[PDB]
Design a protein around this ligand. Structure first.
Ligand SMILES: [Zn+2]
Lengths: 166, 9, 15
């Protein structure tokens, strides 16, 4: 993956990041979809990634994982559909704040992986989606590491896993 | 705003 | 704790 995630010769960095970000959104959207039946208001009253990491709605104001993830994923899809942020027409340049928006998108998608690994790994294994989860996460992480798109603090919840995959 | 993670109580 | 947390865990990947 180290090579596949590298910027192709002559390829535009923003376009490269844009195309891959869409792919990552689709993969995590698919993976979370497989376990939504098990991520409920009762199972996850607060958005967390294990006993050591929790994600507040505002800060503190907390909310369930399903509500948190649905809002986060809806927001990402809206950004992908924003022609001013992710131009699809030829000649239209990416906005000046594109890199910043892309990093925010990736930092947020990471939290979905974190939640699934920490709170629903049992369902992943039962659905035999373990290999799929690991493969998509590895691609995601290798890409972010290649361009240093996610700060070290954000990655804390899956640091142990990150090292093993490396 | 979806702020950065925090250590739970 | 989850299985992937074990130090002996070898991340299974798609083939
Ligand atoms: Zn959940």
């Amino acid at each position: 993956l180290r090579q596949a995630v590298m910027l192709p010769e002559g390829e535009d960095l923003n376009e490269w990041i844009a195309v891959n970000t869409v792919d990552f959104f689709n993969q995590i959207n698919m993976l979370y979809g497989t376990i939504t039946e098990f991520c409920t208001e009762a199972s996850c009253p607060v958005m967390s990634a294990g006993p050591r990491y929790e994600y507040h709605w505002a800060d503190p104001i907390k909310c369930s994982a399903p509500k948190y993830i649905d809002y986060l994923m809806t927001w990402v899809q809206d950004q992908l559909d924003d022609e001013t942020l992710f131009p699809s027409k030829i000649g239209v340049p990416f906005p000046k704040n594109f890199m910043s928006v892309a990093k925010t998108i990736l930092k947020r998608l990471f939290r979905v992986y974190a939640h699934i690994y920490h709170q629903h790994f049992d369902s992943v294994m039962q659905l035999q989606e373990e290999a799929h989860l690991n493969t998509s996460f590895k691609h995601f992480i290798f890409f972010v590491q290649e361009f240093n798109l996610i700060d070290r603090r954000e990655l804390a919840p899956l640091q142990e896993l990150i090292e093993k995959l490396g | 705003a979806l702020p950065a993670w925090a250590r739970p109580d």
